[PDB]
Amino acid sequence: DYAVRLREKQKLRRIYGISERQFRNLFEEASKKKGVTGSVFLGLLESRLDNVVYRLGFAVSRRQARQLVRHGHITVNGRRVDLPSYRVRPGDEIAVAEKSRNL
Amino acid sequence: RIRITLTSRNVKSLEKVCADLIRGAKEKNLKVKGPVRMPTKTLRITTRKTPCGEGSKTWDRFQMRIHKRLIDLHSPSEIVKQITSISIEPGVEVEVT
Amino acid sequence: RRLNRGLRRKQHSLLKRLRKAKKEAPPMEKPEVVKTHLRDMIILPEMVGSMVGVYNGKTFNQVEIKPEMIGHYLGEFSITYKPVKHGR
Amino acid sequence: MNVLADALKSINNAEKRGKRQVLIRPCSKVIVRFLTVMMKHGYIGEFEIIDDHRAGKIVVNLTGRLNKCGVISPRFDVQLKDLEKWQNNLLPSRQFGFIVLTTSAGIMDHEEARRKHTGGKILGFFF
Amino acid sequence: SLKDEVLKIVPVQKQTRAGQRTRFKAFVAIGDHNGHVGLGVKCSKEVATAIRGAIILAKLSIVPVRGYWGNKIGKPHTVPCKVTGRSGSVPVRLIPAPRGTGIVSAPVPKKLLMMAGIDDCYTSARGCTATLGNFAKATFDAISKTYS
Amino acid sequence: RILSGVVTKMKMQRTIVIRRDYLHYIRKYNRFEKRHKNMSVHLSPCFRDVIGDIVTVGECRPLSKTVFNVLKVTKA
Amino acid sequence: LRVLNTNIDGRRKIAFAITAIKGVGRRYAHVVLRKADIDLTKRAGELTEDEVERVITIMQNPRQYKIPDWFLNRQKDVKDGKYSQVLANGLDNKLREDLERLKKIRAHRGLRHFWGLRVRGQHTKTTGRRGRTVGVSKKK
Amino acid sequence: LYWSHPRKFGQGSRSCRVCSNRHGLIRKYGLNMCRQCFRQYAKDIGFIK
Amino acid sequence: AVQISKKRKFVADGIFKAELNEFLTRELAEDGYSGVEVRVTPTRTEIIILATRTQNVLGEKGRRIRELTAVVQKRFGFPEGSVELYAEKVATRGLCAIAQAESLRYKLLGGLAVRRACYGVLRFIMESGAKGCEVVVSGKLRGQRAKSMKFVDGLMIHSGDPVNYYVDTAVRHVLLRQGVLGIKVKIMLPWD
């Protein structure tokens, strides 16, 4: 049963390509908040900047998305953000760097 | 005046064969002496199982019952014609004198 | 060697013949050479003084039998195998 | 044993056996009050006081409604807010059963006490 | 259809003057995960034969567990109430729990509970004997007692 | 402040024993526990108004080294 | 009666008594009596002085030790003679003296005689077998 | 001749064919090392008990 | 062996039949050697080897069978005995113990699960007729500590008691790195 639970964690985590430490802390946060933890946890992971960039199609894969954000290719509401961990909130506009647009 | 000595390991093979030898010969000439059973010799053979042998006690034991039959024929070559023509059992060895 | 019991001597022509040779005359005359096959025989004092010829595989060799030699088996004086000793 | 505990034990068992009725010998006012609560709750049918010219007797009509019931000892006092802890210990099944508590207002179910904002002492449980 | 989980298989021996005679025991749980569960324990000279016999035996005994139904109490991945059953020296305690809890129990009650289709419960083995066989019987006995 | 206690000893300048009674703090425990202390209340100057009476003691400028003054008897 | 050496048979049938002489045994005993014309059945004491003479004369003069026997072959049967005794003195002294003489001293021939191994000097590897046979090799 | 045990002469000491011991040579077998070698592998060369 | 007796040379024919069997048992083993019948006349032997795998006997385009007859003639009939030869196939090897042992042996040589190999083989010989069957592998199964695996179906255990049950018997050896495994196989045919 443990193996089952363990693998499931590993799977969900590996998709996001997030470390155990960060993965765990997010989990704890999701668990703290009101609302079903399972959904909320997914919501927070989905809120990662790198993920959103990935979701937008700016990047082919999540890893590539991470690199893009790291390189400063991505912007949030104008100011550029380098943190793949950055938490996008509703209403934020996530665009490609003007400079980077001709990459 | 020909004596037929039929011998065989298997009784049935002989009974069959000897019977033919009588019936055929019955026509060509005399009636024949009539198949006679004759006593059966029993052979006990102990032979080394392996060719090395040489006293090696590997000699397995085998016994062969050898059955016999007389049905002596006393009469002419036509009778002989009947024999050469038809043959059957391989189980039986025929001795014609 | 291994004596066993009764150091054997082939009666053969040899033992019987030997005593008779001594008896043949008063202790004196002995037949010159007595060819024998009995390589196996054990030398006995009677034999001493005589000259039995022993067979190699090949031939018969004259062996004067002495009192010192008594006990040695006949033959043993007659070597079968030729050693290979040649010039250099 | 104490009268209330005794009454609750008998009812519990007779209920278990499947008996239609039970007679509870000591018939204290407290017992009757306790019974009324169980009745309102649908745990038991009709019951009546029989005058023996002694303690009295209670004839209780068993419904087959009760899974189990008993006295809670000691009768712990409870605040208006304090009930939840007790429901966990006394009612093994969530969403089932009631706690019968005695308040200055009178004997009643915990649920009524709570609506009332009254604390009290816990007499028994039924589920 | 039914899924079969192999709870455990043991080698079990029996000493005799002649020598030890081994046989095999297998515990098998079979369940729909729709509230249908079956436990079977069958022994045989051969392991496979035992396991097969076990599954067949399990299907033979099924208990209705849990369900989502309208205008009634739903029992969504959990059990209607808390119960404790003592079989032999072994007690077993089952308590209902909210979603997300998972099945917290040792093996034995877990395997039974999972095949039961129960997703969230808090359990506790207790009493004198840890004995899995006795514990399993107790869990089964407990599951039976439950009513909605 | 104001205290209530029992007059333990009439013989001498008077004294009152103030007692506190409390239920044990943790439940499953109902030990009724008593605690007490003695204050030398000047029972009174010479009224000798107050053994066995349960009086109230009030804080006062010091009447005596030991003492609080006896405010009034709750009950004999 | 002292028929031979310091030999004295007695109180028994003569044919049996004659056996007592180291030189003679029933084969010889029967012969001497037959040639003697004396009834064997007669007890030695019973014998007649004349008979004692005839017997004594033939036994003494006609016998001694004869040609030595070869190893047992188809020939004369063997007379027993486990240990030395007095026969016609010639037998005992002659055979014993010769074999003993060499034998008494260290002489190899003497040893061979003790051993019963060939005296001639033949190998004992091969023939000269008359005696114990060959043993078997043991597991190595 | 061959049958005659004595040999006027023989060219080569030979050795047995199988192994090579010089003594125990038999012209027939060629097992010079020994007759023993021949005896062991009776099967090897057609010969009868 | 069917032949008319002969008081004079029973010795010769019986040794000869035995001598022929000797080669046939060794040289033809990987074939399913299931029986060698022999018949005789004056200076002519029939000999038929029954085999599951005829082609193994014959050889490619019938080369080996030719070797057999010639080599066999050397054993006896120095003057033209002109011993014949034949090869009939045995219908269904599942019935032949000898073959069955080989099947199991082969698998274990390969490294198959012995337990499985036993069960399947006991199944197949049972599947094609047979009153009963049994297989026993010994040696060190799976290269673990030594034991013997069983498996049986139908009459077998009981059938051993009846004499003239006519149970086909076979054995195969098995070369492994680990060591040999004997395989024995019993097939219960009708009592007759």
Structure description:
- The structure holds 9 chains of a larger assembly.
- Chain E folds into two domains: 3-64, Double Stranded RNA Binding Domain, CATH 3.30.160; 83-145, Ribosomal Protein S5, domain 2, CATH 3.30.230.10.
- Helix content of chain E is 24%, strand content 32%.
- Chain E has helices spanning 47-60, 109-116, 132-145; strands spanning 3-10, 24-31, 36-44, 62-64, 83-87, 90-96, 103-104, 121-125.
- Chain E has a four-stranded antiparallel beta sheet with strand order 1-2-3-4.
- The radius of gyration of chain E is 16 Å and the shape is globular.
- In chain E, 35% of the residues are buried.
- Chain F has no helices and five strands.
- Chain F has a five-stranded antiparallel beta sheet, with no helix packed on it.
- The relative contact order of chain F is 0.31.
- Chain H has one helix spanning 35-40.
- The longest helix of chain H has 6 residues, at 35-40.
- Classes of the chains: A mainly alpha (103), B alpha+beta (97), C alpha+beta (88), D alpha+beta (127), E alpha+beta (148), F mainly beta (76), G mainly alpha (140), H little secondary structure (49), I alpha+beta (192).
- Chains in contact: A-E, B-H, B-I, C-G, C-H, D-E.
- The interface between A and E is small, with 5 and 7 residues.
Give structural attributes:
9 chains of a larger assembly; H: 49 residues; little secondary structure; 30s Ribosomal Protein S14, Chain N; 1 helix; 12% helix; globular; I: 192 residues; alpha+beta; GMP Synthetase, Chain A, domain 3; Ribosomal protein S3 C-terminal domain; 2 domains; four-stranded antiparallel beta sheet; three-stranded mixed beta sheet; 5 helices; 9 strands
What's this model, at a glance?
The PDB classes it as ribosomal protein/rna. Chain A is mainly alpha-helical and 103 residues long. Chain A has 5 helices and 3 strands.
Helical amount of chain H:
10-25%
Q: Tell me the structural class of chain D.
A: alpha+beta
CATH topology of chain H: 30s Ribosomal Protein S14, Chain N
Give the CATH H-level superfamily of chain H: Ribosomal Protein S14/S29
Chain pair with largest interface: C-G, 33 and 26 residues
What would you say the CATH architecture of chain H is?
Irregular
Largest sheet of chain D: 5 strands, antiparallel
Radius of gyration of chain D: 14 Å
Q: Give the oligomeric state.
A: 9 chains of a larger assembly
The N- and C-terminal alpha carbons of chain H lie at a distance of 25 Å
What is the CATH class designation of chain H?
Answer: Few Secondary Structures
Share of β-strand residues of chain H: under 5%
Order of helices and strands of chain H: H
Number of H- or I-type helical stretches of chain D:
4
Named CATH topology of the largest domain in chain D: Ribosomal Protein S8, Chain: A, domain 1
The tally of structural domains of chain D comes to: 2
The string of secondary-structure elements of chain D, in order, is HEHEEEEHEEHE
Question: What would CATH call the class of the largest domain in chain D?
Answer: Alpha Beta
Shape of chain D: globular
PDB class: ribosomal protein/rna
Keywords: protein-RNA complex, 40S ribosomal subunit, ribosomal protein-RNA complex
Entry title: Structure of a mammalian 80S ribosome obtained by docking homology models of the RNA and proteins into an 8.7 A cryo-EM map
Chain A: 40S Ribosomal protein S9e
